[PDB]
Amino acid sequence: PVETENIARGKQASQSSTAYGGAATRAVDGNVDSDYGHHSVTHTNFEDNAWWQVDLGKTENVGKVKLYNRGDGNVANRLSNFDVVLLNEAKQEVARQHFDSLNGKAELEVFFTAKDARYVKVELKTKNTPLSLAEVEVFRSAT
Numbered sequence: 001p002v003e004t005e006n007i008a009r010g011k012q013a014s015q016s017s018t019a020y021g022g023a024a025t026r027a028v029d030g031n032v033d034s035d036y037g038h039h040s041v042t043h044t045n046f047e048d049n050a051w052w053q054v055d056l057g058k059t060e061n062v063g064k065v066k067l068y069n070r071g072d073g074n075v076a077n078r079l080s081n082f083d084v085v086l087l088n089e090a091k092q093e094v095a096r097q098h099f100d101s102l103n104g105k106a107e108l109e110v111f112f113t114a115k116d117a118r119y120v121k122v123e124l125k126t127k128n129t130p131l132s133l134a135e136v137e138v139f140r141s142a143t
């Protein structure tokens with residue numbers, strides 16, 4: 001049971017690198033449109049262990065992180081073999097979940113057990129592959 005407010009929206013975002021103009025802030029712009037050509041999907045270099053991060057700006061009790069995959073050009077499978085990580089204000093890991101695949105689905109819902117975190121990170125574990133996210137949404141645990 002989570003709150004409805006997407007607390008990642010408009011927050012400071014960063015990523016390992018930026019390519020094809022795929023600014024990290026596109027994942028927190030309030031637009032889940034997954035077509036790259038519509039300018040709301042991020043893109044890093046083709047590199048090893050690409051990552052993307054949002055800073056929630058303070059410590060929040062997180063219950064759910066929802067990822068929206070890229071949908072055009074059939075390169076959806078680049079979001080595979082990845083971690084979703086929650087960090088504290090000191091940037092130490094407080095939670096981590098591993099996923100093989102989204103299995104063709106446009107989105108993934110990730111449920112955390114009432115974790116107090118300031119940062120949310122997506123980390124690819126794969127070589128020479130870019131990280132592209134249409135959107136990352138984060139919701140507080142319902143109190």
Ligand SMILES: C[C@@H]1O[C@H](O)[C@@H](O)[C@H](O)[C@@H]1O
Nearest residue numbers: 020036043072073075130
């Ligand atoms: C933005 C570009 O989109 C194309 O469809 C891909 O083939 C390229 O690899 C790159 O990701």
Ligand SMILES: [Ca+2]
Nearest residue numbers: 026031040134
């Ligand atoms: Ca977006």
Ligand code: NI
Nearest residue numbers: 035036037038
């Ligand atoms: Ni179009």
